[PDB]
Amino acid sequence: GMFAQLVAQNVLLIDGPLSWYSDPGLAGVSLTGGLSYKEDTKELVVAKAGVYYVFFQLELRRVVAGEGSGSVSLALHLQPLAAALALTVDLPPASSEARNSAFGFQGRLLHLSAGQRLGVHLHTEARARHAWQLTQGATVLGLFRVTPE
Amino acid sequence: PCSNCPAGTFCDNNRNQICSPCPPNSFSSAGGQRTCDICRQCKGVFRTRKECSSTSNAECDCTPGFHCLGAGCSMCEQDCKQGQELTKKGCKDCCFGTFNDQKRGICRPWTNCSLDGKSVLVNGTKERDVVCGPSPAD
Ligand SMILES: *[C@@H]1O[C@H](CO)[C@@H](O)[C@H](O)[C@H]1NC(C)=O
């Protein structure tokens, strides 16, 4: 069939594109025929055009007690064609109650071209850029086909 | 069938069920796992204690000047200030009747002037200790 799932390689919060684990045999990643991950520009390629369901996952944990706040935004940019997918996760400030976790999910049908490159750019505006990191293995860019073949 | 291969390896259901070494960053600690789990990266406040090995997962300490908080070092709390004692999941503010002056110091009871025959010139707080002295004898 046609589908894929990639786990984000990044951990800290830094602007710019995200690296991914494309190797089957890793915990939650799946890569089938017709889809390859380019380790140079960090963008996976869809060979066969069609309509695909692309879903988005962002989970963050607070690694420093008492600090951190603001928003962490994620965007899926289509290379050969401004933001096809948008997910903005908010980080709670340190309070009497303990909120150490933040999560968001985004998905919708997308029409992809032949050889369309897909990549995810992370842009976070926060008070303390540290004290908040990506949960390892919990950030995922998935894809699976809809259009029949 | 895929069960006979030991820790540090998996079997892919592609490549016909054979057992293969783990990908460059990954680990398998038990049995017949179908996948090598991702190694924990220690970055930011975290320092790597045990490096990533195929048999054992990585362990993270925190940065000098910090300390671990939580089960698996989920958080990092800054080393508490004066008048504070680490409560093992949280830092209390000293305790009522005790004092600590130090970065890492443990909150300890005040000095007792009744046992020294003197009286309190300055009562104690969380940050500082009672200093004894003679009573208002003049
Ligand atoms: C010092 O402070 C404690 C805390 O309130 C109080 O109970 C105690 O009476 C004070 N010392 C004296 C001599 O009053």
Per-residue H/E/C for chain A: CCEEEEEECCCCCCCEECCEECCECECCCEECCCEEEECCCCEEEECCCEEEEEEEEEEEEECECCCCCEEEEEEEEECCCCCCEEEEEEECCCCCCCCCEEEEEEEEEEEECCCEEEEEEEEEEECCCCCEEECCCCCEEEEEECCCC
Tokens encoding B49: 């204690």
Range of the domain at B92: 63-138
DSSP designation for B128 = S
Nearest CA in chain B to A96: B90
In a 13 Å sphere around the CA of A67, the CA atoms on its Cβ side amount to 15
Tokens encoding A117: 């490159």
Residues B70 and B58 placed together within one structural domain of the fold: no
Of B62, B87, B112, the residue at which a domain comes to its end is B62
Query: In B, which residues are within 8 Å of A25 by CB distance?
Result: 10, 12, 20, 22-23, 26, 35-36
Instruction: Identify the CATH number of the domain in which residue A2 sits.
Output: 2.60.120.40
User: What single string gives the DSSP state of each residue in B18-76?
Assistant: -EEEPPSS-B--STT-SSBBPPPP--TTEEEEEPP-SSS--EEEE-BTEEEESTTS-EE
Residues B70 and B128 placed together within one structural domain of the fold: yes
A10 burial level (CB within 10 Å; 0-12, 13-18, 19+): buried
- Mark A95-121 as b/e (b = at least 16 C-beta within 10 Å): eeeeebebebebeeebebeeebbbbbe
Tokens encoding B70: 């939580």
Residues B67 and B56 placed together within one structural domain of the fold: no
Residues B45 and B109 placed together within one structural domain of the fold: no
Asked if B46's CB is within 8 angstroms of A25's CB, the reply is no
Distance CA B12, CA A134 (A): 28
Residues B33 and B23 placed together within one structural domain of the fold: yes
CB A55 within 8 A of CB A49: no
Please, what's the largest Cα pairwise distance for chain B? 97
Distance B97 CA to ligand 1 centre (A): 9
Amino acid type, B45: V
Residues B57 and B101 placed together within one structural domain of the fold: no
CA angle B75/B99/A93 to nearest 5° reads: 30
Amino acid type, B84: Q
Residues 6+ apart with CB under 8 A from B126: B82, B83, B84, B93, B94, B98, B99, B100, B107
User: What is the count of structural domains for chain B?
Assistant: 2
User: What single string gives the DSSP state of each residue in B86-119?
Assistant: E-SSSEE---TTEE--SSSPPPEEPP-STTTT-E
Residues B57 and B16 placed together within one structural domain of the fold: yes
Distance CA B25, CA B9 (A): 13
Distance CA B105, CA B86 (A): 9
Query: How far apart, in Å, are the Cα atoms of B69 and each of A66, A140, B66, B137?
Result: 12, 27, 10, 51
- Mark B50-76 as b/e (b = at least 16 C-beta within 10 Å): eebebeebbbbbbeeebbbbeeebebb
Cα end-to-end distance, chain A, whole Å: 9
Residues B79 and B49 placed together within one structural domain of the fold: no
| Tokens 């110091």 belong to residue | B105
Asked if A26's CB is within 8 angstroms of B35's CB, the reply is yes
Tokens encoding A125: 């505006």
> Experimentally, how was this structure solved?
X-ray
Q: How many CB atoms within 10 Å of residue A15?
A: 11
Range of the domain at A63: 1-149
Residues 6+ apart with CB under 8 A from A14: A122
CB B54 within 8 A of CB B21: yes
CB B30 within 8 A of CB B49: no
Nearest Cβ partner of B75 from A12, A23, A62?
A62
B44 burial level (CB within 10 Å; 0-12, 13-18, 19+): buried
Of B12, B46, B62, the residue at which a domain comes to its end is B62
Q: Is B26 on the interface with A (CB under 8 A)?
A: yes
Residues B10 and B57 placed together within one structural domain of the fold: yes
Of B12, B45, B62, the residue at which a domain comes to its end is B62
Instruction: Identify the CATH number of the domain in which residue B124 sits.
Output: 2.10.50.10
* Strand pairing class (B75-78; B66-69): antiparallel
Residues B80 and B137 placed together within one structural domain of the fold: yes
Bridge partners (DSSP) of residue A26 are A24, B36
Asked if B76's CB is within 8 angstroms of A63's CB, the reply is yes
Bridge partners (DSSP) of residue B119 are B133
